[PDB]
Design a binder for this molecule. Structure first.
Ligand SMILES: Nc1ncnc2c1ncn2[C@@H]1O[C@H](COP(=O)(O)OP(=O)(O)OP(=O)(O)O)[C@@H](O)[C@H]1O
Ligand SMILES: Nc1ncnc2c1ncn2[C@@H]1O[C@H](COP(=O)(O)OP(=O)(O)OP(=O)(O)O)[C@@H](O)[C@H]1O
Ligand SMILES: Cc1cn([C@H]2C[C@H](O)[C@@H](COP(=O)(O)OP(=O)(O)O)O2)c(=O)[nH]c1=O
Ligand SMILES: Cc1cn([C@H]2C[C@H](O)[C@@H](COP(=O)(O)OP(=O)(O)O)O2)c(=O)[nH]c1=O
Lengths: 232, 232
């Protein structure tokens, strides 16, 4: 059993674990905390929907099944210590790296690699740093190739629903065959979603910058995507 | 005429400029300042020596000639807005990016790209950011290829003189033929040099962290390399 900031990971046998989504939200290196009743359920459901879409499109993911409510059954992987960020529209930390305004449409997607390390506060890295960390160029290239394919699929699917995929974060691990498998979660916690018409945030930015009601925003995402009201 | 933090750039015609090295030193985003009589002369002389060595090895540089003392004649270029850092041994900012100690010998060199932008304080970037900045992948790859070749040459040459090239920064621009040309300076200001036996700094780190006498350290570098005492 491993209890993280937003999810719990419970071993089953040797091949699989339980990913349980909690109601907890954190931001700014965990210096901002709150709980949102039903956030876990929403993030679980939405992950399932995204993983199923991606699987239909030939993306290898850790998704195996659901275990009732906020719990997914997933394949255990040897995790890469990376957060892989894909960006279509300028927002968040990109504003400190490029002198471009919020909402600027990028000429092509940006991929950023962040080294998962709490003591160093998850610094950005490049391919050379990754190699020193034991991640080969070949591996990095496959990882970015998948992230960019995931981007296209989610972007297209979401645009047909009036949602702009601004940016998002993925994580990856290796399976026993040494294949690169998409892992962790895909939710309004780990993506920026803007309404196409109004350009307002329907994601964790609502909590990060106090823009209104997180649950309302997450429900709206769930409703726009499924065409149904969240039953919980 | 452009007066920078450590050097002055004076136009000649349309093809060339004067690079004048000043006695000024700055560090920590220019929050630490001092002047060292003779530093300009040392950095000029050492740049000349490095540019000549690199030219003999088939590296295209902006070096044209000397204009007496602290002044070099160099080719005017369309500058890339980059600082290109090559690292052999862990030091400086790399310690905040990888959990490795000062002096750790890297399994292979690291290349880091920093976007030259004072308002953003020169953030690290990757190939994708560079593209948005108008620098093609092809260009980035040629730039890194040159930096890594420069590394090998300087590393080998300096090791034969009992000096460890820990890391260093280069800058590049395009000439009228669209060729990538090595620019700016190569000095104890822009490199880490450690004595092979004692591992002590013979570079700007002496000023950054008050490790003794900058001029003495820079003289020692000049003496170890030329086999002669600095005449000024
Ligand atoms: N298929 C998988 N196999 C093994 N581990 C996984 C898998 N998917 C996700 N994980 C890891 O399980 C954890 C999920 O919990 P959570 O999101 O709360 O992480 P955290 O503890 O907050 O932060 P971190 O784990 O990044 O330090 C993360 O460490 C994630 O990388
Ligand atoms: N061959 C060249 N052609 C045109 N410009 C050059 C050439 N070589 C160096 N430069 C530029 O000239 C300037 C040298 O002066 P200096 O080192 O004092 O820069 P700075 O003003 O302190 O900092 P920066 O210029 O990076 O903001 C730098 O801007 C450098 O990029
Ligand atoms: C680096 C990182 C990004 N992300 C997601 C949130 C955003 O949708 C996108 C880019 O985030 P970014 O703008 O880099 O950081 P911040 O969340 O501090 O503004 O990736 C995470 O969920 N976790 C992370 O650790
Ligand atoms: C980024 C940068 C590096 N360098 C040189 C100094 C070091 O020899 C090497 C790596 O520096 P780095 O460790 O990144 O930064 P700091 O100088 O703040 O410790 O590159 C510069 O001269 N100017 C620069 O703007």
């Amino acid at each position: 059993v491993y209890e993280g900031k937003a999810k719990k990971m419970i071993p089953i046998d040797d091949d699989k674990l339980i990913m349980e989504f909690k109601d907890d939200a954190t931001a700014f290196d965990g210096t901002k905390k709150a709980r949102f009743k039903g956030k876990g359920w929403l993030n679980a459901q939405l992950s399932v929907i995204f993983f199923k879409l991606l699987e239909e499109h030939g993306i290898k993911t850790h998704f195996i099944g659901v275990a009732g409510g906020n719990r997914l059954i997933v394949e255990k992987l040897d995790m890469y210590p990376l957060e892989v960020v894909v960006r279509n529209v300028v927002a968040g930390s990109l504003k400190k790296r490029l002198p471009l305004p919020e909402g600027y449409e990028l000429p092509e997607p940006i991929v950023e690699l962040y080294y998962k390390n709490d003591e160093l506060h998850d610094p950005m890295i490049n391919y050379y740093h990754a190699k020193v960390l034991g991640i080969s160029l070949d591996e990095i290239k496959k990882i970015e190739e998948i992230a960019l394919k995931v981007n296209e699929i989610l972007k297209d699917y979401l645009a047909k629903k009036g949602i702009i995929l601004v940016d998002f974060k993925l994580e990856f691990g290796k399976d026993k065959n040494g294949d690169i498998v998409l892992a962790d979660e895909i939710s309004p916690d780990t993506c920026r979603f803007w309404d196409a018409k109004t350009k307002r945030s329907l994601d964790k930015d609502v909590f990060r910058f106090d823009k209104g009601d997180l649950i309302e925003a997450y429900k709206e995402i769930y409703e726009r995507i499924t065409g149904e009201k969240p039953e919980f």
